Amino acid sequence: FKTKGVIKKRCKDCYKVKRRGRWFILCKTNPKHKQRQ
Amino acid sequence: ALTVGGKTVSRFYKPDSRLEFYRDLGLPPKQIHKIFHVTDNAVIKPGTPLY
Amino acid sequence: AVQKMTRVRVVDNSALGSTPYHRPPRCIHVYNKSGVGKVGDQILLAIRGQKKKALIVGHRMPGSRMTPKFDSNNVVLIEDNGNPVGTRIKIPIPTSLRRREGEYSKVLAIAQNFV
Amino acid sequence: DPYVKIEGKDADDWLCVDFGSMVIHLMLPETRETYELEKLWTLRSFDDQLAQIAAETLPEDF
Amino acid sequence: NTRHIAFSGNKWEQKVYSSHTGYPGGFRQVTAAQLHRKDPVAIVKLAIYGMLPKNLHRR
RNA sequence: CUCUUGGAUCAGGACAUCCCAAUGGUGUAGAAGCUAUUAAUGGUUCGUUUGUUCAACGAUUAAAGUCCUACGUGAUCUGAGUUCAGACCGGAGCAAUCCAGGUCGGUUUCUAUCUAUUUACGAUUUCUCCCAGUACGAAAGGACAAGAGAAAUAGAGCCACCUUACAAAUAAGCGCUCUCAACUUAAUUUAUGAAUAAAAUCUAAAUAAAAUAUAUACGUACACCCUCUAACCUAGAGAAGGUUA
RNA sequence: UUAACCAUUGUAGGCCUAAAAGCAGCCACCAAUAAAGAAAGCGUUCAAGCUCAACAUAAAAUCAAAAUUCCAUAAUUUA
Ligand SMILES: [Mg+2]
Ligand SMILES: [Mg+2]
Ligand SMILES: [Mg+2]
Ligand SMILES: [Mg+2]
Ligand SMILES: [Mg+2]
Ligand SMILES: [Mg+2]
Ligand SMILES: [Mg+2]
Ligand SMILES: [Mg+2]
Ligand SMILES: [Mg+2]
Ligand SMILES: [Mg+2]
Ligand SMILES: [Zn+2]
């Protein structure tokens, strides 16, 4: 959960979701890739 | 609520209102009154001594 | 009630305390949340241009009933590891030290008289 | 029956445990001989080291 | 039926009511839903109070 | 080429968080650490100058946070400097004198008119023991959570004892006692499930749960309608208040 | 322009590179097959291994409307 101005998919397995009013990019294979807007 | 009194005092230097209130209950006046919060099952009839 | 700059008496057989010096030892620090030191409290001592740890064993301030009040503030020198610097104590020591929270068994071993 | 603390962990050579009716001291041979704890308790008031200690009095600083 | 009023939009969660006791640290801000829970009449009364002329006859 | 700040006292407030609290990732085995999110709850020590161009040193702490408030605050107090009348050195000027150079000495008073203000609350942190020398780890090493006991500070009271006074029947601390509940959430993590053909998905879809600091849904305290010549009082500036074979 | 399914070989292409095999390079870059780049990526000491594109089979369809204490009350349609 790095909060960044622009959230970008970093691997093929990365996927996007809209939880609690914000946009998230979540990757299960690499937890490093988790980000918030 | 229940009101309790204690420490009997003299009758001479008191207002009439208080003396009339105590005459109804048939007791000599008390120095102080306070209020206690009691449930319905625990209610006690007025005029009952406590120890 | 020992405080910073209090003058204390070394009740011990250690050479460092025994040898006469032109200045008596003075307290430099009290290892308590409060600054006041009572029986069973460690302190930091300044001796002969040197710093050494020490333990309070008696003082002149009144305490609770049934406990002994001494005529002087008595202290014992303690090494950094916690082993006593000296090998003998002759003055009576209170028995309250046994149960107070802390490490007092080593000092109790060296002390003959308990009052 | 109360619990018992372990003392002397800070020290690397002398450890002592205080039970209700027993006291046990463990130390290395060099430490034991210097303090010579057997002598004191055996000879309660006749210990040699205690005799070496003395008393102090003085009328004036001279 | 003042308990059964309705709010358009997300006003229940976005409208805040403010008050001050007058002592340091006495500033309290509460949302519309919370106030409606505590007092079932406060919301309607506050709306009417604001729309009346600001003079002594208002009270 | 140049040329107002400290301290004491009492603090109000912001969060861009130092400690205490809830969490995500790790080149996270344990223990230590590095980084990021959420939150303002109360707290945030004691002494000292040989050298150091707005620095340093000793001992500690769970921590010794960064800032705003006409140096927060001098009609509450105080130390430097702004800065003079005296006097010396150093460098200038024929002298009188001079210097954003050294040093020693050296004068601000206030009786409060107006605004404002002066009578309760439901706690923070640390340490030892226990779990357990266990989990983990080749070893070395070395914890969670749950349970128990001690303290320290803060608040509110009290006098059987101790200590200090009145060489008075009382007042004090250095003495003693008591301190608690969460309806209402945020970061985050789970469960059922469509848009989207599933075995998908925590949901600014319709739904079900757990989870900081806060706080007042919920309690304690208060409630009485009131004679008064006068005297007395653990009540008091006055007034008020309490007591009266 | 896409979401569905997949992968055989001449040979591991030369090159001091041990070897550098589609993938360090380095020039060539051709072959069979319906359909397969001497390979668009990962990954291997080199190799292995994972993917992409190919095989059939499907479907959809550019920028913009901080420090005392929040601060009118409210409201989406009648010509
Ligand atoms: Mg403050
Ligand atoms: Mg923050
Ligand atoms: Mg002023
Ligand atoms: Mg003088
Ligand atoms: Mg001066
Ligand atoms: Mg001067
Ligand atoms: Mg006045
Ligand atoms: Mg535990
Ligand atoms: Mg489904
Ligand atoms: Mg699921
Ligand atoms: Zn990823």
Short mmCIF file of N, CA and C (backbone and C1' of nucleotides) in Angstrom, two decimals, chain F residues 18-73:
data_model
loop_
_atom_site.label_atom_id
_atom_site.label_comp_id
_atom_site.label_asym_id
_atom_site.label_seq_id
_atom_site.Cartn_x
_atom_site.Cartn_y
_atom_site.Cartn_z
P C F 18 7.61 11.06 14.19
"O5'" C F 18 8.29 10.57 15.55
"C5'" C F 18 9.56 11.06 15.95
"C4'" C F 18 9.75 10.99 17.44
"C3'" C F 18 8.93 9.93 18.18
"O3'" C F 18 9.50 8.64 18.10
"C1'" C F 18 8.81 12.00 19.33
P C F 19 8.55 7.34 18.07
"O5'" C F 19 8.02 7.20 19.56
"C5'" C F 19 8.91 6.89 20.63
"C4'" C F 19 8.19 6.87 21.95
"C3'" C F 19 6.96 5.99 22.03
"O3'" C F 19 7.26 4.63 22.26
"C1'" C F 19 6.51 8.11 23.01
P C F 20 6.32 3.46 21.67
"O5'" C F 20 4.95 3.62 22.46
"C5'" C F 20 4.84 3.20 23.82
"C4'" C F 20 3.47 3.50 24.38
"C3'" C F 20 2.28 2.94 23.61
"O3'" C F 20 2.02 1.58 23.91
"C1'" C F 20 1.89 5.21 24.13
P A F 21 1.88 0.50 22.72
"O5'" A F 21 0.49 0.85 22.02
"C5'" A F 21 -0.73 0.79 22.73
"C4'" A F 21 -1.91 1.13 21.86
"C3'" A F 21 -2.04 0.34 20.56
"O3'" A F 21 -2.60 -0.95 20.74
"C1'" A F 21 -2.36 2.64 20.13
P A F 22 -2.27 -2.13 19.71
"O5'" A F 22 -3.12 -1.78 18.41
"C5'" A F 22 -4.53 -1.85 18.42
"C4'" A F 22 -5.12 -1.57 17.05
"C3'" A F 22 -4.56 -2.37 15.89
"O3'" A F 22 -5.11 -3.67 15.77
"C1'" A F 22 -4.62 -0.09 15.30
P U F 23 -4.38 -4.78 14.87
"O5'" U F 23 -4.38 -4.16 13.40
"C5'" U F 23 -3.47 -4.63 12.41
"C4'" U F 23 -3.52 -3.79 11.16
"C3'" U F 23 -2.52 -4.15 10.07
"O3'" U F 23 -2.92 -5.26 9.27
"C1'" U F 23 -2.45 -1.83 10.42
P G F 24 -1.83 -6.31 8.74
"O5'" G F 24 -1.27 -5.65 7.39
"C5'" G F 24 -2.12 -5.44 6.28
"C4'" G F 24 -1.40 -4.77 5.13
"C3'" G F 24 -0.06 -5.36 4.73
"O3'" G F 24 -0.17 -6.53 3.93
"C1'" G F 24 0.13 -3.01 4.86
P G F 25 0.99 -7.64 3.98
"O5'" G F 25 2.23 -6.95 3.27
"C5'" G F 25 2.16 -6.55 1.91
"C4'" G F 25 3.43 -5.87 1.45
"C3'" G F 25 4.73 -6.62 1.69
"O3'" G F 25 4.97 -7.64 0.74
"C1'" G F 25 4.99 -4.37 2.34
P U F 26 5.90 -8.89 1.13
"O5'" U F 26 7.29 -8.23 1.51
"C5'" U F 26 8.20 -7.80 0.50
"C4'" U F 26 9.48 -7.26 1.08
"C3'" U F 26 10.37 -8.27 1.79
"O3'" U F 26 11.17 -9.02 0.89
"C1'" U F 26 10.16 -6.33 3.12
P G F 27 11.87 -10.39 1.38
"O5'" G F 27 13.19 -9.91 2.11
"C5'" G F 27 14.36 -10.71 2.12
"C4'" G F 27 15.62 -9.88 2.02
"C3'" G F 27 15.52 -8.46 2.56
"O3'" G F 27 15.74 -8.40 3.96
"C1'" G F 27 16.51 -8.42 0.41
P U F 28 14.68 -7.66 4.92
"O5'" U F 28 13.38 -8.57 4.81
"C5'" U F 28 13.37 -9.90 5.31
"C4'" U F 28 12.71 -9.99 6.66
"C3'" U F 28 12.40 -11.39 7.16
"O3'" U F 28 13.51 -12.02 7.77
"C1'" U F 28 10.48 -10.03 7.40
P A F 29 14.16 -13.35 7.13
"O5'" A F 29 13.62 -14.52 8.06
"C5'" A F 29 12.24 -14.84 8.10
"C4'" A F 29 11.97 -16.05 8.97
"C3'" A F 29 11.76 -15.77 10.45
"O3'" A F 29 10.46 -15.30 10.75
"C1'" A F 29 13.24 -17.59 10.19
P G F 30 10.27 -14.05 11.75
"O5'" G F 30 10.89 -14.56 13.13
"C5'" G F 30 10.05 -14.92 14.21
"C4'" G F 30 10.85 -15.32 15.42
"C3'" G F 30 11.37 -14.19 16.29
"O3'" G F 30 10.40 -13.67 17.18
"C1'" G F 30 13.10 -15.76 15.91
P A F 31 9.97 -12.12 17.10
"O5'" A F 31 11.02 -11.38 18.04
"C5'" A F 31 11.73 -12.07 19.06
"C4'" A F 31 13.05 -11.41 19.37
"C3'" A F 31 13.14 -9.92 19.08
"O3'" A F 31 12.60 -9.13 20.12
"C1'" A F 31 15.06 -11.03 18.22
P A F 32 12.28 -7.57 19.89
"O5'" A F 32 13.71 -6.91 19.68
"C5'" A F 32 13.88 -5.82 18.78
"C4'" A F 32 15.30 -5.73 18.28
"C3'" A F 32 15.59 -4.56 17.35
"O3'" A F 32 15.92 -3.37 18.04
"C1'" A F 32 16.34 -6.56 16.34
P G F 33 15.15 -2.00 17.72
"O5'" G F 33 15.83 -1.49 16.37
"C5'" G F 33 15.05 -1.17 15.22
"C4'" G F 33 15.76 -1.56 13.95
"C3'" G F 33 15.31 -0.86 12.68
"O3'" G F 33 15.86 0.43 12.53
"C1'" G F 33 15.48 -3.18 12.28
P C F 34 14.91 1.71 12.34
"O5'" C F 34 14.77 1.86 10.76
"C5'" C F 34 15.91 1.85 9.93
"C4'" C F 34 15.57 1.52 8.50
"C3'" C F 34 14.30 2.15 7.94
"O3'" C F 34 14.47 3.50 7.54
"C1'" C F 34 14.30 -0.14 7.42
P U F 35 13.32 4.58 7.85
"O5'" U F 35 12.16 4.23 6.82
"C5'" U F 35 12.37 4.34 5.42
"C4'" U F 35 11.22 3.76 4.63
"C3'" U F 35 9.84 4.36 4.88
"O3'" U F 35 9.64 5.60 4.22
"C1'" U F 35 9.68 2.01 4.85
P A F 36 8.58 6.66 4.81
"O5'" A F 36 7.16 6.00 4.53
"C5'" A F 36 6.55 6.09 3.25
"C4'" A F 36 5.26 5.31 3.18
"C3'" A F 36 4.12 5.79 4.07
"O3'" A F 36 3.41 6.89 3.53
"C1'" A F 36 4.34 3.46 4.30
P U F 37 2.61 7.89 4.50
"O5'" U F 37 1.24 7.13 4.81
"C5'" U F 37 0.40 6.68 3.77
"C4'" U F 37 -0.76 5.86 4.29
"C3'" U F 37 -1.57 6.48 5.41
"O3'" U F 37 -2.52 7.43 4.95
"C1'" U F 37 -1.09 4.22 5.93
P U F 38 -2.86 8.73 5.84
"O5'" U F 38 -3.67 8.15 7.09
"C5'" U F 38 -4.97 7.62 6.92
"C4'" U F 38 -5.49 6.99 8.19
"C3'" U F 38 -5.55 7.89 9.41
"O3'" U F 38 -6.70 8.72 9.41
"C1'" U F 38 -4.62 5.79 10.01
P A F 39 -6.62 10.25 9.90
"O5'" A F 39 -6.52 10.14 11.49
"C5'" A F 39 -7.59 9.61 12.25
"C4'" A F 39 -7.19 9.40 13.69
"C3'" A F 39 -6.55 10.59 14.37
"O3'" A F 39 -7.51 11.51 14.88
"C1'" A F 39 -5.26 8.64 14.79
P A F 40 -7.11 13.04 15.18
"O5'" A F 40 -6.17 12.95 16.46
"C5'" A F 40 -6.72 12.71 17.75
"C4'" A F 40 -6.03 13.54 18.81
"C3'" A F 40 -6.43 15.02 18.84
"O3'" A F 40 -6.49 15.48 20.19
"C1'" A F 40 -4.10 14.83 18.51
P U F 41 -7.71 15.04 21.13
"O5'" U F 41 -7.06 13.98 22.13
"C5'" U F 41 -7.81 13.44 23.20
"C4'" U F 41 -7.03 12.40 23.97
"C3'" U F 41 -5.86 12.91 24.79
"O3'" U F 41 -6.28 13.45 26.03
"C1'" U F 41 -5.28 10.89 23.65
P G F 42 -6.18 15.03 26.32
"O5'" G F 42 -4.87 15.18 27.20
"C5'" G F 42 -4.85 14.77 28.56
"C4'" G F 42 -3.66 13.90 28.87
"C3'" G F 42 -2.33 14.61 28.99
"O3'" G F 42 -2.15 15.23 30.25
"C1'" G F 42 -2.09 12.64 27.69
P G F 43 -0.98 16.31 30.46
"O5'" G F 43 0.35 15.53 30.06
"C5'" G F 43 1.27 15.11 31.05
"C4'" G F 43 2.28 14.13 30.49
"C3'" G F 43 3.59 14.72 30.00
"O3'" G F 43 4.50 15.03 31.05
"C1'" G F 43 2.80 13.16 28.42
P U F 44 5.27 16.44 31.08
"O5'" U F 44 6.68 16.14 30.40
"C5'" U F 44 7.19 14.82 30.27
"C4'" U F 44 7.91 14.62 28.95
"C3'" U F 44 8.75 15.79 28.47
"O3'" U F 44 10.02 15.82 29.10
"C1'" U F 44 7.47 14.91 26.67
P U F 45 10.85 17.20 29.22
"O5'" U F 45 11.66 17.01 30.58
"C5'" U F 45 10.99 16.80 31.81
"C4'" U F 45 11.91 16.25 32.87
"C3'" U F 45 13.03 17.17 33.31
"O3'" U F 45 12.61 18.15 34.24
"C1'" U F 45 13.88 14.99 32.95
P C F 46 13.60 19.34 34.67
"O5'" C F 46 14.89 18.59 35.22
"C5'" C F 46 15.02 18.29 36.60
"C4'" C F 46 16.41 17.81 36.94
"C3'" C F 46 17.52 18.84 36.88
"O3'" C F 46 17.55 19.69 38.01
"C1'" C F 46 18.23 16.84 35.84
P G F 47 18.37 21.07 37.97
"O5'" G F 47 19.88 20.61 38.11
"C5'" G F 47 20.94 21.46 37.67
"C4'" G F 47 22.23 20.70 37.54
"C3'" G F 47 23.37 21.44 36.85
"O3'" G F 47 24.06 22.32 37.72
"C1'" G F 47 23.16 19.29 35.90
P U F 48 24.52 23.77 37.20
"O5'" U F 48 25.72 23.45 36.20
"C5'" U F 48 26.87 22.75 36.65
"C4'" U F 48 27.75 22.31 35.51
"C3'" U F 48 28.27 23.40 34.59
"O3'" U F 48 29.35 24.12 35.14
"C1'" U F 48 27.51 21.58 33.30
P U F 49 29.93 25.41 34.36
"O5'" U F 49 31.08 24.82 33.43
"C5'" U F 49 32.11 25.68 32.94
"C4'" U F 49 32.67 25.23 31.61
"C3'" U F 49 33.16 26.36 30.71
"O3'" U F 49 34.45 26.07 30.18
"C1'" U F 49 31.60 24.98 29.54
P U F 50 35.71 26.94 30.68
"O5'" U F 50 36.89 26.58 29.68
"C5'" U F 50 38.05 25.91 30.14
"C4'" U F 50 38.87 25.35 29.01
"C3'" U F 50 38.30 25.53 27.61
"O3'" U F 50 38.73 26.74 27.00
"C1'" U F 50 38.72 23.24 27.98
P G F 51 37.82 27.48 25.90
"O5'" G F 51 38.00 26.62 24.58
"C5'" G F 51 39.11 26.83 23.71
"C4'" G F 51 39.16 25.80 22.62
"C3'" G F 51 37.98 25.80 21.65
"O3'" G F 51 38.12 26.77 20.62
"C1'" G F 51 38.42 23.59 22.37
P U F 52 36.87 27.68 20.18
"O5'" U F 52 36.01 26.73 19.23
"C5'" U F 52 36.64 25.95 18.21
"C4'" U F 52 35.65 25.08 17.48
"C3'" U F 52 34.35 25.77 17.09
"O3'" U F 52 33.87 25.26 15.84
"C1'" U F 52 33.87 23.94 18.50
P U F 53 33.49 26.27 14.65
"O5'" U F 53 32.22 27.05 15.20
"C5'" U F 53 32.13 28.47 15.10
"C4'" U F 53 30.78 28.93 14.60
"C3'" U F 53 30.60 28.86 13.09
"O3'" U F 53 29.22 28.74 12.75
"C1'" U F 53 30.60 31.12 13.77
P C F 54 28.34 27.51 13.28
"O5'" C F 54 27.69 28.06 14.63
"C5'" C F 54 26.77 29.14 14.62
"C4'" C F 54 25.61 28.88 15.55
"C3'" C F 54 24.38 28.24 14.90
"O3'" C F 54 23.88 27.19 15.74
"C1'" C F 54 23.75 30.22 16.05
P A F 55 24.01 25.66 15.27
"O5'" A F 55 25.36 25.16 15.95
"C5'" A F 55 25.44 23.89 16.56
"C4'" A F 55 26.87 23.56 16.93
"C3'" A F 55 27.06 22.37 17.88
"O3'" A F 55 27.08 21.12 17.22
"C1'" A F 55 28.18 24.23 18.76
P A F 56 26.61 19.80 18.00
"O5'" A F 56 27.51 19.77 19.31
"C5'" A F 56 28.84 19.27 19.26
"C4'" A F 56 29.61 19.56 20.53
"C3'" A F 56 29.45 18.57 21.66
"O3'" A F 56 30.19 17.38 21.48
"C1'" A F 56 29.32 20.76 22.52
P C F 57 29.61 15.98 22.02
"O5'" C F 57 29.75 16.08 23.60
"C5'" C F 57 31.01 15.92 24.23
"C4'" C F 57 30.96 16.27 25.69
"C3'" C F 57 30.22 15.31 26.60
"O3'" C F 57 30.94 14.13 26.90
"C1'" C F 57 29.64 17.53 27.16
P G F 58 30.16 12.76 27.17
"O5'" G F 58 29.59 12.93 28.65
"C5'" G F 58 30.45 12.84 29.77
"C4'" G F 58 29.70 12.96 31.07
"C3'" G F 58 28.56 11.98 31.29
"O3'" G F 58 28.99 10.69 31.67
"C1'" G F 58 27.86 14.15 31.90
P A F 59 28.19 9.39 31.17
"O5'" A F 59 26.91 9.35 32.12
"C5'" A F 59 27.04 9.44 33.52
"C4'" A F 59 25.72 9.72 34.19
"C3'" A F 59 24.55 8.83 33.80
"O3'" A F 59 24.57 7.57 34.43
"C1'" A F 59 23.85 11.08 33.83
P U F 60 23.79 6.33 33.78
"O5'" U F 60 22.26 6.63 34.13
"C5'" U F 60 21.24 6.45 33.16
"C4'" U F 60 20.04 7.32 33.46
"C3'" U F 60 18.73 6.91 32.82
"O3'" U F 60 18.08 5.86 33.52
"C1'" U F 60 19.05 9.23 32.52
P U F 61 17.23 4.76 32.71
"O5'" U F 61 16.04 5.58 32.05
"C5'" U F 61 14.90 5.95 32.81
"C4'" U F 61 13.95 6.80 32.00
"C3'" U F 61 13.22 6.10 30.86
"O3'" U F 61 12.07 5.40 31.30
"C1'" U F 61 14.13 8.14 30.08
P A F 62 11.98 3.79 31.19
"O5'" A F 62 11.12 3.53 29.88
"C5'" A F 62 11.74 3.29 28.62
"C4'" A F 62 10.77 3.49 27.48
"C3'" A F 62 10.90 4.81 26.73
"O3'" A F 62 11.87 4.74 25.70
"C1'" A F 62 8.63 4.45 27.32
P A F 63 13.23 5.59 25.78
"O5'" A F 63 12.83 7.00 25.17
"C5'" A F 63 12.29 7.10 23.86
"C4'" A F 63 11.41 8.32 23.70
"C3'" A F 63 12.05 9.65 24.05
"O3'" A F 63 12.87 10.15 23.00
"C1'" A F 63 9.86 9.53 24.96
P A F 64 14.46 10.01 23.08
"O5'" A F 64 14.94 11.38 23.72
"C5'" A F 64 14.71 12.62 23.06
"C4'" A F 64 13.59 13.40 23.72
"C3'" A F 64 13.90 14.87 24.01
"O3'" A F 64 12.73 15.66 23.82
"C1'" A F 64 13.37 13.76 26.03
P G F 65 12.78 17.00 22.93
"O5'" G F 65 12.28 16.53 21.50
"C5'" G F 65 11.02 15.91 21.32
"C4'" G F 65 10.62 15.89 19.87
"C3'" G F 65 10.45 17.25 19.20
"O3'" G F 65 11.68 17.83 18.82
"C1'" G F 65 8.63 15.84 18.63
P U F 66 11.82 19.43 18.72
"O5'" U F 66 11.04 19.81 17.39
"C5'" U F 66 11.53 19.42 16.12
"C4'" U F 66 10.60 19.86 15.01
"C3'" U F 66 10.25 21.34 14.98
"O3'" U F 66 11.25 22.12 14.35
"C1'" U F 66 8.28 20.05 14.78
P C F 67 11.22 23.73 14.46
"O5'" C F 67 9.68 24.06 14.69
"C5'" C F 67 9.17 25.38 14.55
"C4'" C F 67 7.75 25.37 14.03
"C3'" C F 67 6.88 26.55 14.44
"O3'" C F 67 7.08 27.69 13.63
"C1'" C F 67 5.70 24.52 14.78
P C F 68 7.05 29.17 14.28
"O5'" C F 68 5.50 29.48 14.47
"C5'" C F 68 4.68 29.82 13.36
"C4'" C F 68 3.24 30.02 13.77
"C3'" C F 68 2.97 31.10 14.81
"O3'" C F 68 2.94 32.40 14.25
"C1'" C F 68 1.76 29.14 15.36
P U F 69 3.46 33.66 15.11
"O5'" U F 69 2.36 33.84 16.25
"C5'" U F 69 1.02 34.19 15.93
"C4'" U F 69 0.09 33.96 17.10
"C3'" U F 69 0.36 34.79 18.34
"O3'" U F 69 -0.15 36.11 18.25
"C1'" U F 69 -0.03 32.54 18.95
P A F 70 0.84 37.36 18.10
"O5'" A F 70 1.16 37.77 19.60
"C5'" A F 70 2.10 38.79 19.96
"C4'" A F 70 2.96 39.27 18.81
"C3'" A F 70 4.26 39.93 19.24
"O3'" A F 70 5.24 39.80 18.21
"C1'" A F 70 2.85 41.54 18.25
P C F 71 6.42 38.71 18.32
"O5'" C F 71 6.51 38.37 19.88
"C5'" C F 71 7.47 39.00 20.72
"C4'" C F 71 8.67 38.12 20.94
"C3'" C F 71 8.42 36.81 21.67
"O3'" C F 71 7.93 35.80 20.82
"C1'" C F 71 10.36 37.88 22.54
P G F 72 6.86 34.72 21.34
"O5'" G F 72 5.47 35.50 21.32
"C5'" G F 72 4.30 34.90 20.78
"C4'" G F 72 3.07 35.20 21.60
"C3'" G F 72 3.28 36.04 22.86
"O3'" G F 72 3.25 37.43 22.59
"C1'" G F 72 2.04 34.10 23.40
P U F 73 4.19 38.45 23.39
"O5'" U F 73 3.69 38.34 24.90
"C5'" U F 73 2.38 38.73 25.28
"C4'" U F 73 2.07 38.28 26.68
"C3'" U F 73 3.04 38.76 27.75
"O3'" U F 73 2.70 40.05 28.24
"C1'" U F 73 2.71 36.42 27.97
#
